[PDB]
Symmetry: D2
Subunit: 351 residues, 4 copies
């Protein structure tokens, strides 16, 4: 047996907290190189104190966020940083009613023989890392795999390998009391339409859950972090929020066992507002959906806050109020009760 | 390159939903001729076409209190072409009472070389033309049975994969020709294993099945599954409550069966008529979320009392029919969570390596 | 264990006879509908006696064929027919030093969900059929799967299913003392070039042998019947007999364990003469090749005999001498010693 | 979309052929630091960088009678950057004697949750940049070890598949960066199983490996394999002749290893120096056709006498070296079928769950 009954209950508990009703996740875990591009976009230098101040900005927003945010995914460096008032960032997060999460993958690597496809690395020593992260206050984890729709992608070799590394990663995580968020991202890059994303999404989740079965993963103690199902970014043809919602809820109904505790969508380049509108179309779909359907958003919670901060410490409480509007909009959207410029900008970046 | 058009998928889904509409279940009257003989020998009756015609008729024409109970009826090939005394074809007897007509299409288990007594099922050859015909002739769903066993080194990786593949080939051919497939990967109760063993293996098997149905591009909303409940093995020394069997069973399905599956219609196994109904009722009362219909596809466990009451004697026709009805009514309340409860219906109906 | 030591030795023996040095197989097993098209091509009516006379024509050719032909694959009907002199056709075949073979597949069937791909049927009741065929004098068997190179073919589902039915078929065959000839045909249809056939050939054999392992097949008691590796039929670009030979011998070296007793190529639409020339390029390749590399030819042994018969009983010994020249040319070609109109005709037919 | 250009494939194949050119074999001096300690404790010597530097030097600088014997030498990372007393880097000592320089790149076994004590190996992270470096620094082949065990329900389907996958990832990254991979799927001798058990399992494992290398688009002609011989288990009561071990071993390879594989360099296992050489010789004398080089990649079984003779004492340097040489000469005649034959070289070198 991979896990005892006591360990199993710890993971089911943690997982049910994160996606408790009306709650989602703040995906604040950009690498140093990734937060560089977002900082550069607003003229701000990429320094440890600027990254600490921006992350402090988001975690210390006012208590209206506390029922909207069940967990916060951090990057290594940030997990060991402190707020201005001396408190370490994980206590800041718990103090407001959220679970601390840590991103543990070490990025993507090319898979030879293929048309530009990648797998993901980071399992070397992961068991010790997780033990220490759990000791230092993290209770869930994140791993991101990346597949792309092209004419000979996602490859069979690609789907199989990424599904297998996901499951390893998750086996290790649960051995150490850490709930794994399983992230199989199909990028929106390309001109494919909606049905094609739906075919490819179904195909990839089927392989993911098979691989999870094979490796003995306790599914009640996992979260699934999939793309919404949407046309490609360069698709000429257009589709409604209902067509997207149907197509996403259909693909997940056909592949994800009800035992999975929560589905926390990535935004994938969607504008802040479209991400919220779609998330709401999905939770208003009449079809039966046996799991939480909520948000795990990075860019679609932070773009308005970033441009309202501008790097200027005076703008803190305008930036913080921009985050809290998107945090509140999504908490309503994952219950179907959201019906409403920098929030309308496409956030799509190639790869 | 899609397997099915949007209309083909709507017909298949409507059919699958009529069969498990709330309160309803399936009567499996689909015994092979050599299998049903072993039943009539047990009530001292010769195995003639006419005694088979008569006993089937008794089940199909029981009074109209069963109609809200019976969503589908699975027939052996022979029976699909037989007629009541009325002269009405049995398909039409079934339809007129509100049920969908089903047909068993497998051709029995065969052994897998190099394994400890494990089997696949055969019957794909010419299946597509057989289905087109069965569909012209009134059938709207099919059944195919695969058999796995818990044992030392069984079910092996080979048997789990080969059996799931062939269920996937069967399912794809049925849907091309208009017919909802019931996917039955039966794990036998033979052996002394405990409940958790049977749960582990059931989860492994059903994950392999639904990966195979995905690889073969099967339309799940036009499917049903007929699995075993998660039960201790037949010879197991230890005792498990009905609520433990409900927990293990609902948990095993929630870990493997995608919500898109329209329904799960359990086989009775070796269980007695009364145990089959109580476990099914405890299952529908499990407060865990269960996004599919949980109902019955019972062969022995709808017919044990009827067959003992009938005894071979034309004079008991109405007395047999009544015992069948009382069980169909029991299982209709069980398949809604509302069954609160003789010797025939408490008797174990277990047979080593069930075959039909 | 699938098989005892005594059964294993019977199959290794049979398999080594068929592909003994300088010997190949006559693939005379066309269905009734398939021999119709070849008969119609020469004006002859498709009647049982005409099919019996044509098959009698080939099996009763003079004793110069006896060291060229190790086995003869027949169709059901023919296995139960007799020569003019009363002898049943299998005794005719054995009397000249060859093994009787029987084709046991029941043709191809479409696989739904795919771009025109098929699997193959015929396992229903195959175990009994083989028991009876073995009793009636057959000692090996044939099963044909068909894959096609197009832009999304051979599919993963297609390769996996055909590899699995091959292995079933072969498990049954060996249980009954019958050596299975495993036929994974990649058709030459299309405009693909040589490397693409080589990639696809390697990919399909890798899956075939894995599937054979999984099902416990005794490989010393099998034969492999693959396509040569060649450009597609509509390829503009041109390739030498050496390039074909290298590419075929490379693909097989990379996928077929040395334990396989013999490789008996299908001709696939090649002209009688090209089939012979290529077979010889292959056996003259200096690279190491641990198995017999020989012929299992239907069309490329019979086209000249068919057109020389013309349906006229007077032409019997001109037709029979045409077969015996192609039989002798190939027996030399599978040893590298063949160096030399109706024999130059492309025999390619779509599907 | 090819993994490798025609030149990349020629470099990889030339390298693979130098290493197993006829008569030659591999010296595996690639012990982890915590593993080699367990060796020097056995001759009462402290495990210091300098005692490790010295013992490796003794093996690498043995007289030039070993050069026709040793095609490659696998080094632990530490040793690749050490120098002889000459001041010459050990890579250059090896090259100058006619051998190819190898490097162990795995990072040890880790456990697989949910299994009976089974493991994968780890070490892919940053492997590509590690290889580029190792290649700049003189290394032309790599080694990665996976460990499987025969037991009740092991090796399981999970462990067989996961271990083959990760050997395939390792192999593809090595070839991108210029380096011939040695694929080592070691099946341990622990247990009391017989020879046929170990043959069955070896055939199952090597079929999974070579399916995985195909799925990952690995260039087999630039590969080597280091498997175990097919041997009875360490505790097996029954006795098997060397010719039976040759039969089972050559048969297992001929059923699974494609002829394109350039060579098979066996690990010694728990075998004594003398048994390792005799079984390897019986293997090369098997008259069955064997289209690949059959030679040695021996760690313990090239070094047991050398290490006991050296004893930690600088004065025995030439006496240790001589024992190593005599074994390298024995295994060079064995790896051609021509070995006709002390206590150190008859001693079992078995250790429960070998790790390094």
């Amino acid at each position: 047996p991979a896990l005892t009954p006591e360990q199993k209950k710890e993971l089911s508990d943690i997982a049910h907290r994160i996606v408790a009703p009306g709650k989602g996740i703040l995906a604040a875990d950009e690498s140093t190189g990734s937060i560089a591009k977002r900082l550069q976009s607003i003229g701000t230098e990429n320094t440890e104190e600027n990254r600490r101040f921006y992350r402090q900005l988001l975690l210390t927003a006012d208590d209206r966020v506390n029922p909207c945010i069940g967990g916060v995914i951090l990057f290594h460096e940030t997990l060991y940083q402190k707020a201005d008032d001396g408190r370490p960032f994980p206590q800041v997060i718990k103090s407001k009613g959220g679970v601390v999460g840590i991103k543990v993958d070490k990025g993507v690597v090319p898979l030879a023989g293929t048309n530009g496809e990648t797998t993901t690395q980071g399992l070397d020593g992961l068991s010790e890392r997780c033990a220490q992260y759990k000791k230092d206050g993290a209770d869930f984890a994140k791993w991101r795999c990346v597949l792309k729709i092209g004419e000979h992608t996602p490859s069979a070799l690609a789907i199989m390998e990424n599904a297998n590394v996901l499951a390893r990663y998750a086996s290790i995580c649960q051995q150490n009391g850490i709930v794994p968020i399983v992230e199989p991202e199909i990028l929106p890059d390309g001109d494919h339409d909606l049905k094609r994303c739906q075919y490819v999404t179904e195909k990839v989740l089927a392989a993911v859950y098979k691989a999870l079965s094979d490796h003995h993963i306790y599914l009640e103690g996992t979260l699934l972090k999939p793309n919404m199902v949407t046309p490609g970014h360069a698709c000429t043809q257009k589709f409604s929020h209902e067509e997207i919602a149907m197509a996403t809820v259909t693909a997940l109904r056909r592949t994800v066992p009800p035992a999975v505790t929560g589905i926390t969508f990535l935004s994938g380049g969607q504008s802040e507002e479209e991400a919220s509108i779609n998330l709401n179309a999905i939770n208003k779909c009449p079809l039966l959906k046996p799991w939480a359907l909520t948000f795990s958003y990075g860019r679609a919670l932070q773009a308005s806050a970033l441009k309202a901060w501008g790097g200027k410490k005076e703008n803190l409480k305008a930036a913080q109020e921009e985050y809290v509007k998107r945090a509140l909009a999504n908490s309503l959207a994952c219950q179907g009760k959201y019906t409403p410029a920098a929030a309308s900008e496409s956030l799509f970046v190639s790869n």
